[PDB]
Amino acid sequence: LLGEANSFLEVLEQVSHLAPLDKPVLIIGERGTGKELIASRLHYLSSRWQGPFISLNCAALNENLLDSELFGHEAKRHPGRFERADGGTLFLDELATAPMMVQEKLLRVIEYGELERVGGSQPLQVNVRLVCATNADLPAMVNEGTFRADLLDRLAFDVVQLPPLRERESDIMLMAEYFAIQMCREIKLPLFPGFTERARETLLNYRWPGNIAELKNVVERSVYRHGTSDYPLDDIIIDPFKRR
């Protein structure tokens, strides 16, 4: 993982302590900030490192399909993500989009380690270390009535705050250089020719709403359009949709 900003190195240190626990971990951060890599690192540094690492984007699924995907369904049965994560770690992204029904059932699995079943089948016990992520303000959602406080009192054992790229200014050029160099290997340029000061200013003054994912994509496109090692990269193409 790239970066040397102090906020980021403190995140890695915090992860190294949290990983060995079985407690749930909440990661707060914007899109493209590295949340799922952190979750993965929590898994591989824990004692479950040999178990499954399963991830799910909650905002991708309608209420009934999310319900089925997390908790499974019958009526001979489709196992949900908690079953597939048994002995391992489940990463739930976009937690704040989960409907209240899902949030409440999630509380029950954290509390009582089991998934109940429709039918004459008895409830299913599961053993899963949970990591969840969002950018929302969950305390504020609790005030609004759109996120459950009972859930947050079990889910938020501790909180990993991943800083946005605009607050890791010192890692911007370091990461752009790394991504530029990988893109030079991909298009077979002999050497990355460097960034002009103008390119640097463009990179450093942009607020990066998509953070590191967006940085990578902008840098790759830019290197490709530049297309040579004979002079430094001057034109950073932030927005490829801009017209004529």
Binding site residue list = 29-36, 85-94
Of residues 19, 14, 26, 33, the one with CA closest to residue 96? 26
Residues forming the annotated binding site for ATP? 29-36, 85-94
Token pair in block for residue 94: 């976009």
Size of the site for ligand ATP (CB under 6 A): 15
Contact between 36 and ligand ATP per CB under 6 A: yes
Is the CB of 34 or the CB of 193 nearer to ligand ATP?
A: 34
CA 152 – CA 24 distance, rounded (Å): 10
Instruction: Note whether 79 and 45 are within 8 A (CB).
Output: no
Report in angstroms the alpha-carbon separations of 193 from 13, 98, 133.
34, 46, 38
H-helix or E-strand spanning residue 177:
helix 169-186
Contact between 214 and ligand ATP per CB under 6 A: no
Instruction: Note whether 34 and 163 are within 8 A (CB).
Output: no
Give the shortest CB-9-to-ligand ATP separation in angstroms: 11
Among 11, 18, 26, 33, interactor with ligand ATP by CB under 6 A = 33
Give the shortest CB-142-to-ligand ATP separation in angstroms: 22
Instruction: Note whether 126 and 86 are within 8 A (CB).
Output: yes
Is the CB of 24 or the CB of 32 nearer to ligand ATP?
A: 32
Give the shortest CB-63-to-ligand ATP separation in angstroms: 20
Among 212, 223, 233, 236, interactor with ligand ATP by CB under 6 A = 212
Token pair in block for residue 165: 């790229």
Contact between 3 and ligand ATP per CB under 6 A: yes
Is the CB of 71 or the CB of 91 nearer to ligand ATP?
A: 91
Give the shortest CB-75-to-ligand ATP separation in angstroms: 33
Phi, psi for 229 (deg, rounded to 5): -105, 0
**Hey, which residues between 163 and 192 contact ligand ATP (CB under 6 A)?**
none
Contacts made by residues 83-86, CB under 8 angstroms, sequence distance 24+: 83/115, 83/124, 83/126, 84/52, 84/54, 85/51, 85/52, 85/53, 85/54, 85/126, 85/128, 86/51, 86/52, 86/126, 86/127, 86/128
Among 58, 93, 151, 202, interactor with ligand ATP by CB under 6 A = 93
Contact between 193 and ligand ATP per CB under 6 A: no
Contact between 35 and ligand ATP per CB under 6 A: yes
Among 12, 37, 59, 140, interactor with ligand ATP by CB under 6 A = 37
Contact between 2 and ligand ATP per CB under 6 A: yes
Q: 158-161 and 25-28: which strand pairing?
A: parallel
In the complex, the residues that contact ligand ATP under the rule CB under 6 A are 1-3, 29, 31-37, 93, 212-213, 216
